[PDB]
Amino acid sequence: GPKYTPAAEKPRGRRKTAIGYVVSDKMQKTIVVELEDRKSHPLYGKIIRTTKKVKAHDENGEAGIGDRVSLMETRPLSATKRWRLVEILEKA
Amino acid sequence: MTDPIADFLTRLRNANSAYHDEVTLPHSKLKANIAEILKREGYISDYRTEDARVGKSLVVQLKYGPSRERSIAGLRRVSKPGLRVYAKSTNLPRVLGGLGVAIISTSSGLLTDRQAARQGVGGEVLAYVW
Amino acid sequence: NIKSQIKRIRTNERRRLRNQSVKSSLRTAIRGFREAVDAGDKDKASELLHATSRKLDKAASKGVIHPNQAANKKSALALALNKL
Amino acid sequence: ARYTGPATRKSRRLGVDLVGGDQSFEKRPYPPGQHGRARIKESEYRQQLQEKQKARFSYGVMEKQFRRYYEEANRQPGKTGDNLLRILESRLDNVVYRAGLARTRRMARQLVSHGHFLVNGVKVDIPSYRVSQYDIIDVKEKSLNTLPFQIARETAGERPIPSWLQVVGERQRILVHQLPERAQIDVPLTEQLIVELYSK
Amino acid sequence: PTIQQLVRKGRRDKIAKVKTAALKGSPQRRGVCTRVYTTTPKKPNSALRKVARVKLTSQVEVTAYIPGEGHNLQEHSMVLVRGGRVKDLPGVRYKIIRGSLDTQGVKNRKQARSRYGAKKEK
Amino acid sequence: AVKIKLTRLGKIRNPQYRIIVADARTRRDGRAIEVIGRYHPKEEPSLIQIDSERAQYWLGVGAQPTEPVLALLKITGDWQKFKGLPGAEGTLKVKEPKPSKLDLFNAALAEAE
RNA sequence: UACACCCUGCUGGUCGCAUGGCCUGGUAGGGGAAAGCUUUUGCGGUGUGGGAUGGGCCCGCGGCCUAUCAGCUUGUUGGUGGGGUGAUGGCCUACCAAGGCGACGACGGGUAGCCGGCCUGAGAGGGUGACCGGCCACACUGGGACUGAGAUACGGCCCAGACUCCUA
RNA sequence: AUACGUAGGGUCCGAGCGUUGUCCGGAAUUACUGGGCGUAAAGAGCUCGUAGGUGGUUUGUCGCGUUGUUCGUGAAAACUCACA
């Protein structure tokens, strides 16, 4: 038979992507983004709404304070920075 | 002031209980449809909306039979603020074991227990009257 | 505790002792290539990169270093030559 | 396992026929002892306890085997009162007794003790054996030729065979057909008290 | 009551109300008894009840009752203490098993015949 | 590597076996990747019921049955499909026909009357 | 000798998740192996392409208590370039910058392996991780290293103590 | 003294039968289901307001919450139904 036998494409993607607001675009190639949750309480039923301060990598510095942006998770790119700013749709 | 629909139901309860044969109300579409379905199933006599303070006003006549007896048995908002309530297609509660009727604000609009059971969508129930 | 495998003890001592000299020699060659590249001489760097791409590839074919560490070092020295 | 005492004293205490034809119990219907005459502090507790004790002592069944009867009856889809009476009317010794082939409950108890019966071809020395519908039943010849068992089989003028049991030949073949039905059992005092008490 | 305030905090039970304190909730412990002096029960129940104070192996010093009529235990005895509840006596919530490690069963006990360490009559 | 194994089940005196596929480094009763058969020496015909085509796949990728597992494979004729040397045929025996639940009482009634 | 493979220089096409991915891309330069025994059912060796299964890393979410525990934080955070690693990544390291974490409870004190489950309870709920199963951690103690595809290496090793034993 | 102790005599259970230890429910005795706070437990001495929760009438959007649906999915045993 052929010397070379081929491989597969392992359908890949769907890295977690969500809409956040840039809030601490302060450090070089670095932004901090926040998210919203709306979850029914396990016991009572009072839907609580909380947040989360993810750290994202901006190689370009496009974002800024209070911008409605989107983020996809990457490979771990540093100690607490695991997000890629893509599909920006609001500033300020 | 926090809750308008609870005050709607409280006024219905007091006015019917205190033997009044009518009640007047501001006309926000929510309570409008609540009283609309109420007369639809016949726990009240008839509702009519006219013009008032900047909005409009709905006036509700309570159905009383041969004596001063109310077809309404009672009213209680369930999906209140701070405890808003959602329900699904399967476990659609049966009011008074199924005797009564309820309000369930479906994604397709507004439906009761039996209607939503015949159809099968859920998401938000409200007060029930029996 | 002694149980029917001191032969493994001697085997592992030998296996980890040969790699000591092998790794010392390879690291000395790599450091020499480092002085070649930092000195700014490109012919010596090219020849040392050639020799080390031979040597570390041999060592990876042998049982001293995993295949990919050798490729990493080969690429690093190759770029060090390519830019000097 | 097995109890020891006779049935006359328990008959008198519980105040019901446990032998069925106990001459001495009707001779002394009051409970045994110096104070069977003395009136009891009546309680529905006593009513239910008397009911369950009559049920236990009538068939030769015994208490721990009796509790699991109620538990499995409650596990059944039907109402527990029906299921308990059905299963208590579904015992191997009960099946062979209602055919009129044993003059006493202890008759069948000691018969299954000895191994004088056969269900579907397998010998079961276990009175707690369950006999299903359409089971083939037979009696061994060693007991068949025994004199008192000859009397029991040939003078079987005892209680009639219920519709769910059918002795269909000289081989004492009790070709069971259906379950003991509530409309067919003709049970002694009911068991709703047992269900209500145990459920609490 | 302020569902949100429940989310903030709340909904804990009141108090354990512990009963046994020998140790480990032990079905029984063993130890050395002392101070076997008899004290007085409540005035309406005028009598005198024989008790002792036992230092159990659990390294706690508790008060045990001596049930029955006769006793076998004395000072420096390997008494097996079990939990009990004697409302007739103040602060006495223990007993010592008869027919056991140290204390011989109560002599000629026949109404109980299992308690009080009364073995089977031959 | 990978091996097709017999794993033990049932109570003490009567053994039963599930034909599983698993790593060697596991134990006799580890997490089965897939149950592909079952077998019981205790029952009369040593009756075996095997998921066939999954075994075909696993033999294709290189599953290596245990010695009695391989014996069972031959007992099925499954080893005559992946290897396919003579072709696959029914090799295992079967439990005897035996009467039914209803015909027993039918015959009993016929005998009685 | 390999070019089946890897590294580099350039470059064509192609899919994109941005790093990039695919054409054993190509090109050109460079480099990388092996085995015998045995007649004997034959067993065996090297390299690569693929399966299979075993894995290694990261993340969503779930599940102790205690401010009579409210500040914590400098390799901490981000970037850069490297060292190192199987691969990412302050993992490490030189510089740069000052961030980052918390009342939606940090940082502390105490406490505990955890789940399929099991048991009670009508239900919710509550209590447990017996055994049978699923993983993890640990194998005088504490530090260190080894090898192999793979090591807290329980019946592998060294070093610092403990303890014990033998002792010229 | 039918309560003690003793005898019968009776109740029940049975190779068991009682005692201790622990957990759940009964307890609504944490009251989400399913509690209260004038006199029984419970409105700080009184203000404002950060955090937080929390919302008037009405137009269009989004469908996050929420619901509807397809599928992957939740080892075996679990536990149950049904069969042997």
mmCIF file of N, CA and C in Angstrom, chain D residues 60-101:
data_model
loop_
_atom_site.group_PDB
_atom_site.id
_atom_site.type_symbol
_atom_site.label_atom_id
_atom_site.label_comp_id
_atom_site.label_asym_id
_atom_site.label_seq_id
_atom_site.Cartn_x
_atom_site.Cartn_y
_atom_site.Cartn_z
ATOM 1 N N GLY D 60 -50.717 -20.301 61.415
ATOM 2 C CA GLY D 60 -49.410 -20.778 61.803
ATOM 3 C C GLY D 60 -48.271 -19.876 61.391
ATOM 4 N N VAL D 61 -48.556 -18.788 60.671
ATOM 5 C CA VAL D 61 -47.529 -17.809 60.360
ATOM 6 C C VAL D 61 -47.034 -17.161 61.649
ATOM 7 N N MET D 62 -45.865 -16.536 61.563
ATOM 8 C CA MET D 62 -45.189 -16.031 62.744
ATOM 9 C C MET D 62 -44.628 -14.648 62.425
ATOM 10 N N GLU D 63 -44.338 -13.885 63.483
ATOM 11 C CA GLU D 63 -44.439 -12.427 63.428
ATOM 12 C C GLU D 63 -43.500 -11.802 62.396
ATOM 13 N N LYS D 64 -42.218 -12.173 62.415
ATOM 14 C CA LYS D 64 -41.268 -11.524 61.512
ATOM 15 C C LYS D 64 -41.610 -11.807 60.055
ATOM 16 N N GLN D 65 -42.015 -13.041 59.752
ATOM 17 C CA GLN D 65 -42.508 -13.347 58.415
ATOM 18 C C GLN D 65 -43.793 -12.587 58.114
ATOM 19 N N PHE D 66 -44.535 -12.202 59.152
ATOM 20 C CA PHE D 66 -45.791 -11.489 58.942
ATOM 21 C C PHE D 66 -45.556 -10.023 58.588
ATOM 22 N N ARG D 67 -44.543 -9.392 59.188
ATOM 23 C CA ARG D 67 -44.313 -7.971 58.921
ATOM 24 C C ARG D 67 -43.914 -7.730 57.468
ATOM 25 N N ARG D 68 -43.027 -8.569 56.928
ATOM 26 C CA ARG D 68 -42.662 -8.421 55.527
ATOM 27 C C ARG D 68 -43.850 -8.670 54.613
ATOM 28 N N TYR D 69 -44.835 -9.451 55.063
ATOM 29 C CA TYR D 69 -46.070 -9.589 54.302
ATOM 30 C C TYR D 69 -46.750 -8.238 54.122
ATOM 31 N N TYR D 70 -46.926 -7.489 55.212
ATOM 32 C CA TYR D 70 -47.517 -6.160 55.098
ATOM 33 C C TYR D 70 -46.660 -5.254 54.227
ATOM 34 N N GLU D 71 -45.339 -5.316 54.402
ATOM 35 C CA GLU D 71 -44.468 -4.417 53.650
ATOM 36 C C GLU D 71 -44.571 -4.673 52.148
ATOM 37 N N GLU D 72 -44.522 -5.942 51.739
ATOM 38 C CA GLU D 72 -44.653 -6.263 50.322
ATOM 39 C C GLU D 72 -46.062 -5.990 49.815
ATOM 40 N N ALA D 73 -47.074 -6.131 50.676
ATOM 41 C CA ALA D 73 -48.430 -5.766 50.286
ATOM 42 C C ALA D 73 -48.530 -4.278 49.987
ATOM 43 N N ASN D 74 -47.908 -3.449 50.826
ATOM 44 C CA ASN D 74 -47.901 -2.013 50.577
ATOM 45 C C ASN D 74 -47.107 -1.670 49.326
ATOM 46 N N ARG D 75 -46.035 -2.417 49.045
ATOM 47 C CA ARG D 75 -45.308 -2.192 47.800
ATOM 48 C C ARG D 75 -46.145 -2.530 46.570
ATOM 49 N N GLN D 76 -47.159 -3.384 46.709
ATOM 50 C CA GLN D 76 -47.969 -3.760 45.562
ATOM 51 C C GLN D 76 -48.798 -2.572 45.075
ATOM 52 N N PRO D 77 -49.106 -2.523 43.774
ATOM 53 C CA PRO D 77 -49.870 -1.380 43.244
ATOM 54 C C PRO D 77 -51.244 -1.216 43.868
ATOM 55 N N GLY D 78 -51.912 -2.309 44.218
ATOM 56 C CA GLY D 78 -53.226 -2.214 44.813
ATOM 57 C C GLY D 78 -53.168 -1.722 46.245
ATOM 58 N N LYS D 79 -54.352 -1.547 46.828
ATOM 59 C CA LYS D 79 -54.437 -1.127 48.218
ATOM 60 C C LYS D 79 -53.879 -2.208 49.134
ATOM 61 N N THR D 80 -53.188 -1.771 50.191
ATOM 62 C CA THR D 80 -52.419 -2.694 51.022
ATOM 63 C C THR D 80 -53.311 -3.739 51.681
ATOM 64 N N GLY D 81 -54.522 -3.351 52.083
ATOM 65 C CA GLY D 81 -55.428 -4.317 52.683
ATOM 66 C C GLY D 81 -55.716 -5.485 51.763
ATOM 67 N N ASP D 82 -55.962 -5.200 50.483
ATOM 68 C CA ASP D 82 -56.210 -6.265 49.516
ATOM 69 C C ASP D 82 -54.978 -7.140 49.322
ATOM 70 N N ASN D 83 -53.812 -6.518 49.158
ATOM 71 C CA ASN D 83 -52.606 -7.278 48.851
ATOM 72 C C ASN D 83 -52.194 -8.170 50.016
ATOM 73 N N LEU D 84 -52.326 -7.672 51.248
ATOM 74 C CA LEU D 84 -51.955 -8.472 52.412
ATOM 75 C C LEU D 84 -52.821 -9.719 52.525
ATOM 76 N N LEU D 85 -54.137 -9.570 52.357
ATOM 77 C CA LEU D 85 -55.015 -10.734 52.417
ATOM 78 C C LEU D 85 -54.752 -11.685 51.257
ATOM 79 N N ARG D 86 -54.466 -11.145 50.069
ATOM 80 C CA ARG D 86 -54.145 -11.997 48.930
ATOM 81 C C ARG D 86 -52.905 -12.837 49.205
ATOM 82 N N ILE D 87 -51.833 -12.199 49.680
ATOM 83 C CA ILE D 87 -50.580 -12.920 49.883
ATOM 84 C C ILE D 87 -50.684 -13.883 51.057
ATOM 85 N N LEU D 88 -51.358 -13.489 52.141
ATOM 86 C CA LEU D 88 -51.589 -14.427 53.229
ATOM 87 C C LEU D 88 -52.472 -15.582 52.789
ATOM 88 N N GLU D 89 -53.253 -15.395 51.728
ATOM 89 C CA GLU D 89 -53.962 -16.489 51.087
ATOM 90 C C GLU D 89 -53.190 -17.066 49.909
ATOM 91 N N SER D 90 -51.864 -16.914 49.896
ATOM 92 C CA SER D 90 -51.036 -17.389 48.793
ATOM 93 C C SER D 90 -49.858 -18.233 49.273
ATOM 94 N N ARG D 91 -49.966 -18.847 50.447
ATOM 95 C CA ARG D 91 -48.878 -19.648 50.982
ATOM 96 C C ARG D 91 -49.011 -21.107 50.548
ATOM 97 N N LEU D 92 -47.860 -21.778 50.438
ATOM 98 C CA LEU D 92 -47.842 -23.179 50.020
ATOM 99 C C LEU D 92 -48.706 -24.037 50.936
ATOM 100 N N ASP D 93 -48.473 -23.943 52.247
ATOM 101 C CA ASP D 93 -49.319 -24.657 53.192
ATOM 102 C C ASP D 93 -50.758 -24.170 53.121
ATOM 103 N N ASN D 94 -50.968 -22.868 52.913
ATOM 104 C CA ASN D 94 -52.324 -22.361 52.725
ATOM 105 C C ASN D 94 -52.967 -22.948 51.472
ATOM 106 N N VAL D 95 -52.210 -23.022 50.375
ATOM 107 C CA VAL D 95 -52.742 -23.575 49.132
ATOM 108 C C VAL D 95 -53.158 -25.027 49.332
ATOM 109 N N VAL D 96 -52.299 -25.820 49.975
ATOM 110 C CA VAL D 96 -52.635 -27.226 50.167
ATOM 111 C C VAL D 96 -53.721 -27.407 51.223
ATOM 112 N N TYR D 97 -53.854 -26.464 52.159
ATOM 113 C CA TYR D 97 -54.884 -26.567 53.187
ATOM 114 C C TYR D 97 -56.266 -26.277 52.619
ATOM 115 N N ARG D 98 -56.386 -25.223 51.809
ATOM 116 C CA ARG D 98 -57.697 -24.874 51.276
ATOM 117 C C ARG D 98 -58.234 -25.917 50.305
ATOM 118 N N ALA D 99 -57.387 -26.825 49.819
ATOM 119 C CA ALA D 99 -57.857 -27.933 48.999
ATOM 120 C C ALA D 99 -58.555 -29.009 49.818
ATOM 121 N N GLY D 100 -58.567 -28.881 51.144
ATOM 122 C CA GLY D 100 -59.191 -29.866 52.002
ATOM 123 C C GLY D 100 -58.369 -31.107 52.256
ATOM 124 N N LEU D 101 -57.073 -31.078 51.954
ATOM 125 C CA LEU D 101 -56.211 -32.241 52.105
ATOM 126 C C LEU D 101 -55.490 -32.282 53.447
#
